[PDB]
Design a protein around this ligand. Structure first.
Ligand SMILES: *[C@@H]1O[C@H](CO)[C@@H](O)[C@H](O)[C@H]1NC(C)=O
Ligand SMILES: *[C@@H]1O[C@H](CO)[C@@H](O)[C@H](O)[C@H]1NC(C)=O
Ligand SMILES: *[C@@H]1O[C@H](CO)[C@@H](O)[C@H](O)[C@H]1NC(C)=O
Ligand SMILES: *[C@@H]1O[C@H](CO)[C@@H](O)[C@H](O)[C@H]1NC(C)=O
Ligand SMILES: *[C@@H]1O[C@H](CO)[C@@H](O)[C@H](O)[C@H]1NC(C)=O
Ligand SMILES: [Ca+2]
Ligand SMILES: [Ca+2]
Ligand SMILES: [Ca+2]
Ligand SMILES: [Ca+2]
Lengths: 388, 478, 323, 98
């Protein structure tokens, strides 16, 4: 990347490692998980690191296990502004044949609905765990080979481990490492026109298929043409200097100008798109401090404080109830409050004195003496001390 | 109410089965293999299980067509994509497995299309390894190179130089013509076809080069290699996202660092990481001009290209159009715009889509001067959309391995009974060709090759310069 | 015909190309007209708060003009002088009223002294445009086909579909105004019903009926004769439109303002004529003729002599020289 | 340099008769202002103007090549399917024939 390294060093990509020996990096080829991403209005990413857009409004098949049928994902897409070139996600449906042949639905809130039933988070069933992440974003976790991300305002993500190498089919491609084959219709042939690909994965015949995927919605709103330039001009500004050599910014810039001219309010459409790039930079190692009072710093409530890179392990009051559980989480970004304070259910965070206990789930007040004939139990400080 | 048609029967949601997949999961031919959601059915009238809906018609059999490009195909109908046929037997397309012949390209001044297909930007000024065979653990037969000068910014400058190193030879080209600095050993495979606007140039069984006389470099490799090469065109493996494997054997994300790994002179000036923007230098803060250039590149999406747009994405080729001609000033000969279109038009021709997009008020391309040397204008040289490249001549009477179907340019058209020779510009009767047929068999017009090296006792050599029915004596080793 | 006509007359009132009026008190810019498949241009009208300020033409991607109530003009943000002719758009004054001509692009816009946007548009765009002035089809009712394309019965949410925001301001849905007329009814409907009525009664208006219908015109006035306190003049805006709307059809009317007791505003030295030629023989002019075969346009102009010289009417004797 | 065709070996006859200096000033002025993206007539025309003035003084000139302002004439003889090719750009041909 235009900088020198001594021999013997072992720099590491996110996927694997590489070592300098005789001016030649040696490298493994071992697989590593892929990600199909939805965001913006209609900007998609394949497993094989393709980018495109398909502003179709129907229940399309996002992804699916295709040699067996461990799961299947179905986006549902909607027009999302006065403009015709503004089609964002409403909801996504997930289907687990492995458990009940149930049907999970991710709702435009942070809400989820299983089989029509609204459900509290966490949702420990046998395999799938559904809990908030920052308390503003849902995360499904089926087994170990699957993740999801919040489909509230439509930023759906996935994590497919390499066990699914090449055996998926949908909008998101094969997950085979090949970026070129990705427009492969269900009838088994690569289509050069995106307008052919997405409409082949709708689930309803009544859905009109489109004919042209416009590139410049800014034409139909000439007012925003000026603004759309300077707005994501910061994307290439040296504010993001540290991860130009981590991921190609040029599409994320392209995906900005489609969104800001398209949506109703370009304020957040801008600042959701910039976070789109920062999230990818962070997913490779590089965090960026790109928030300002002008550049859309969120407003953590008075109980909370903004934080750049922190540990979502010791935050919730539940953690004191289940301390033994592992928290193999990253250094995440969001609204925390200082370490003396732990998060309470009511949006405030509190010291651990009045931090209730969640024994059997049951929300015991901080002082609850509590016992059968045979057991003997109390809630001290967030932990539930049982005996016999 | 309405009693639905006879060919199908009404359904009712049972009160027990949550799986009331009735009207909502109306299976058409598209969504049959696709799995559907359903809360409950409706009071609709759905086809029997043995059939589906088909455009307001419950087509009975599972014979309903196999779509491609949003178009019908009956079962049994075939489609030709690339060098493969492909039939839809039941409902999915069933294709062959003949991998086709890939093709590098230099569309404009500084852009590069890989074999597997990867446009990327790389303004360079040093000499670079376009493609070679000497890659890792191979013999290293051919070493096609490229060298540009004053070509970081596209303009009327940037005359390319190309030096191609095969069979221990040194033949190179620039400035309109080709030059042999060192002839190679096996002259038999050597071949040059100056036809139309191109210099078609074979070098062997599985190698061919094409040159537009101006900038473009379209080398064509056969099925032989299949990951035996590397350079700026990638590896030719089919994998499309591993074409940026630098010479130090690691994928790079930023192509400007990539091609720096492939420069020959390891001490010249490596290029500079440009800040990324949608506007080149001229179009930078020149929004007025920036629209006029934009509209002009929309010929790539015009009524005349509508056939080819469905096959080949114009979007890659558009990006080059806008990039070059902003940077280019296009004062005199405005080829820094005309060429980018011609590049797309030829790719269209390779897929069988000849196009006539060239008018008198846009990139005219006259052909009158060849019909000048004779005092009387016989008028045989006519410019033509895409006339075939591999014909027979006095110099090349035999048919040649023809990597390119047809090509643009001036093409001498005259009635039959006359074969073209380039020295005497017109076409001429066949007998006037200095053609050679020694001891009966049909071959070329006296190639300058010493046949029969293998057996000394059978060293029965017969050259032919132009016409002579001669045979030379072999010098004995003893 | 071969032409169209939209009008934003008086306060909040609109006239589409096809005889469909309503009222709208917007809050920001709104697209008046332009292509819908592709836009070589676009006409937008900014409303401060219901009341209008600025007409503007965004010519594709690269050029813009903002002419506004006061009368001053800018290009981008740099205030320019007038006249002004860049990029094939001649920004001129006619009959004391400001004009923007886009004949290459097939439109003519203008404003009067009071502030009344008008758009004459070429038949090249039939069942083609779609904006706030409706489609240039024939149907004088379907002309509410939203930015998605939806026949909406409401004349209000429709206009709010064609909202365009900028970075300087992001605008919302305005609200329909709550009328104070509903309680302050009193005599104001009895004595003042007549000035709306005279569109029908008076003979000078009694002859465009086979061409147009005053019934919407009398309908749209009666709701706006109630907010203004103490004035018969409140009828003449809705009326003044009816004059032009008949005139555009190919049948002009004459001298109607003589007894109407309302003349449209114009600066000193001029008052409202009807059907003055656009080629006002001014002071510093070349004496050539029979090139100005243009159609005849209404507006205020000088007396019989009193040649124009720099926005005022001055006697022909005192024509200056220039160097 | 591009406008120095107006002072080139091919115009040496006409340079002695007609001053190229007026015509040069227009060359540089127009094509700077002009962008000359597609049909680059905002340069080709200025030269053709000078070349005709040269013709009026009896100095026919052939300055037009294939790599500079080509000016084909096939269309006609092309449309003439039966290519009896006749529409040959007769250089500076007598405008007033029968
Ligand atoms: C493809 O066609 C061949 C030849 O008819 C047949 O043998 C094979 O089963 C087919 N395969 C598929 C996937 O349809
Ligand atoms: C031009 O060449 C094309 C392609 O070879 C051929 O189909 C066509 O007949 C030719 N036309 C003329 C006028 O020679
Ligand atoms: C009046 O003109 C001034 C100066 O050009 C401008 O700043 C202002 O916006 C105008 N106001 C109105 C109501 O047009
Ligand atoms: C109106 O335009 C639509 C869309 O182009 C077209 O389908 C229809 O025929 C047109 N109708 C009339 C009355 O011109
Ligand atoms: C026609 O053009 C030729 C070649 O330039 C020239 O020699 C000849 O004088 C011309 N004849 C006429 C009639 O213009
Ligand atoms: Ca794939
Ligand atoms: Ca590759
Ligand atoms: Ca209408
Ligand atoms: Ca003479």
């Amino acid at each position: 990347s235009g900088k020198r390294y001594p021999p013997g060093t072992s720099l590491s990509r996110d996927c694997n490692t590489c070592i300098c020996r005789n001016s030649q990096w040696i490298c493994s080829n071992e697989e590593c998980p892929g990600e199909c991403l939805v965001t913006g209005q209609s900007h998609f990413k394949s497993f094989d690191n393709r980018y495109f857009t398909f502003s179709g409004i129907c229940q399309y098949l996002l992804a699916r296990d295709c040699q067996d049928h461990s799961f299947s994902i179905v986006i549902e897409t909607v027009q999302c502004a006065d403009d015709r070139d503004a089609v964002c996600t409403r909801s996504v449906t997930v289907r687990l044949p492995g458990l009940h042949n149930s049907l999970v639905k991710l709702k435009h809130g942070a809400g989820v609905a299983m089989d029509g039933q609204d459900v509290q988070l966490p949702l420990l069933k046998g395999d799938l765990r559904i809990q908030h992440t920052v308390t503003a974003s849902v995360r499904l976790s089926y087994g170990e080979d699957l993740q999801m991300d919040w489909d509230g305002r439509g930023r759906l993500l996935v994590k497919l481990s390499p066990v699914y190498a090449g055996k998926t089919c949908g909008l998101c491609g094969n997950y085979n490492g090949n970026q070129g084959d990705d427009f492969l219709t269900p009838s088994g042939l690569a289509e050069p026109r995106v307008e052919d690909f997405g409409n082949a994965w709708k689930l309803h015949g009544d859905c009109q298929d489109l004919q042209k995927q416009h590139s410049d919605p800014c034409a139909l709103n000439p007012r925003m043409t000026r603004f759309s330039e300077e707005a994501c001009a910061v994307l290439t500004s040296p504010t993001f200097e540290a991860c130009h050599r981590a991921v190609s910014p040029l599409p994320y810039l392209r995906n900005c100008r489609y969104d800001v001219c398209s949506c109703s309010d370009g304020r957040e459409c801008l600042c959701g798109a910039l976070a789109s790039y920062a999230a990818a930079c962070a997913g490779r190692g590089v965090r960026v401090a790109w928030r300002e009072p002008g550049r859309c710093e969120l407003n953590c409530p008075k109980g909370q404080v903004y934080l750049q890179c922190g540990t979502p392990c010791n935050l919730t009051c539940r953690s004191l109830s289940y301390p033994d559980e592992e928290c193999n989480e990253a250094c995440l970004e969001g609204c925390f409050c200082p370490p003396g304070l732990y998060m309470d259910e009511r949006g405030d965070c509190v010291p651990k004195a009045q931090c209730p206990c969640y024994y059997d789930g049951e929300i015991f007040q901080p002082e609850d003496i509590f016992s059968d004939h045979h057991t003997m139990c109390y809630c001290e400080d967030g932990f539930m001390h049982c005996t016999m | 109410s309405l009693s639905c048609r006879p060919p199908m029967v009404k359904l009712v949601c049972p009160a027990d089965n949550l799986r009331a997949e009735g009207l909502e999961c109306t299976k058409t031919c598209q969504n049959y293999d696709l799995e559907c959601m359903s809360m409950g059915c409706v009071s609709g009238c759905l086809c029997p299980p043995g059939m589906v809906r088909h455009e307001n018609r419950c087509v009975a059999l599972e014979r309903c067509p196999c779509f491609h490009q949003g178009k019908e195909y009956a079962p049994g109908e075939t489609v030709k994509i690339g060098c493969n046929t492909c039939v839809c037997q039941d409902r999915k397309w069933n294709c062959t497995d003949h991998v086709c012949d890939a093709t590098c390209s230099t569309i404009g001044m500084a852009h590069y299309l890989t074999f597997d297909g990867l446009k990327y930007l790389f303004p360079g000024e040093c000499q670079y390894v376009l493609v070679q065979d000497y890659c890792g653990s191979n013999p290293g037969t051919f070493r096609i190179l490229v060298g540009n000068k004053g070509c970081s910014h596209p303009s009327v400058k940037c005359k390319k130089r190309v030096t191609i190193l095969v069979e221990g030879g040194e033949i190179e080209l620039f400035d309109g013509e080709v030059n042999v600095k060192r002839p190679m050993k096996d002259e038999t495979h050597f071949e040059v076809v100056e036809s139309g606007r191109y210099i078609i140039l074979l070098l062997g069984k599985a190698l061919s080069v094409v040159w537009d006389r101006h900038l473009s470099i379209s080398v064509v490799l056969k099925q032989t290699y299949q990951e035996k090469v590397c350079g700026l065109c990638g590896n030719f493996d089919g994998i499309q996202n591993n074409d940026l494997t630098s010479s130090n054997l690691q994928v790079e994300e930023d192509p400007v660092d990539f091609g720096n790994s492939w420069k020959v002179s390891s001490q010249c000036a490596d290029t500079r990481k440009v800040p990324l923007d949608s506007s080149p230098a001229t179009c930078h803060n020149n929004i007025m001009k920036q629209t006029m250039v934009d509209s002009s590149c929309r010929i790539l999406t015009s009524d005349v290209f509508q056939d080819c747009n469905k096959l080949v994405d114009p979007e890659p080729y558009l990006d080059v159009c806008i990039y070059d001609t902003c940077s280019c000033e296009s004062i005199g000969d405005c080829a820094c715009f005309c060429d980018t279109i011609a590049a797309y038009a030829h790719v269209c021709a390779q897929h069988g889509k000849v196009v006539t997009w060239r008018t008198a008020t846009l990139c005219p391309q006259s052909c009158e001067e060849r019909n000048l040397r004779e005092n009387g204008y016989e008028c045989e040289w006519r410019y033509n959309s895409c006339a075939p490249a591999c014909q027979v001549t006095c110099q090349h009477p035999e048919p040649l391995a023809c990597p390119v179907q047809c090509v643009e340019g001036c093409h001498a058209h005259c009635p039959p009974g006359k074969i073209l020779d380039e020295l005497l510009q017109t076409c001429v009767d066949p007998e006037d060709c200095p053609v050679c047929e020694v001891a009966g068999r049909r071959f070329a017009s006296g190639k300058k090759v010493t046949l029969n090296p293998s057996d000394p006792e059978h060293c029965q050599i017969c050259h032919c310069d132009v016409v002579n029915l001669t045979c030379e004596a072999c010098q004995e080793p003893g | 015909s071969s032409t169209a006509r939209c009008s934003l007359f008086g306060s909040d009132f609109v006239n589409t190309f096809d005889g469909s009026m309503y009222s709208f008190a917007g809050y920001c810019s709104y697209l008046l007209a332009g292509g819908c498949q592709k836009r070589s241009f676009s006409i937008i009208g900014d409303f401060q708060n219901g009341k209008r300020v600025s007409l503007s033409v965004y010519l594709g991607e690269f050029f813009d003009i903002h002419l506004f109530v006061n009368g001053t003009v800018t290009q981008g943000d740099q205030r320019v002088s007038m006249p002004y002719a860049s990029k094939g758009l001649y920004l001129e004054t006619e009959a004391g009223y400001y004009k923007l001509s886009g004949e290459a692009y097939g439109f003519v816009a203008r404003i009067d002294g009071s502030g009344n946007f008008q758009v004459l548009l070429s038949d090249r765009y039939f069942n083609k445009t779609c904006g706030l002035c409706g489609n240039f089809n024939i149907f004088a009712e379907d002309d509410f086909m939203t930015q998605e394309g939806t026949l909406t019965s409401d004349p209000y949410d429709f206009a709010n579909s064609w909202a365009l925001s900028s970075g300087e301001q992001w605008c919302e849905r305005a609200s329909p105004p709550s009328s104070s007329c509903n309680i302050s009814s009193g005599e104001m409907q009895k004595g003042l019903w007549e000035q709306c009525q005279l569109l029908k009664s008076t003979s000078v208006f009694a002859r465009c009926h086979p061409l147009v219908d005053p019934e919407p015109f009398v309908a749209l006035c009666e709701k706006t004769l109630c907010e203004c306190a103490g004035g018969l003049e409140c009828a003449c805006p809705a009326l003044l439109e009816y004059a032009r709307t008949c005139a555009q059809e190919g049948m002009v009317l004459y001298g109607w303002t003589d007894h109407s007791a309302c003349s449209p505003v114009c600066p000193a030295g001029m008052e409202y004529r009807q059907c003055v030629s656009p080629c006002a023989r001014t002071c510093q002019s070349l004496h050539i003729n029979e090139m100005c075969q243009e159609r005849c346009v209404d507006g205020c102009s000088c007396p019989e002599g009193q040649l124009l010289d720099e926005g005022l009417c001055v006697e022909s004797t005192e024509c200056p020289c220039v160097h």
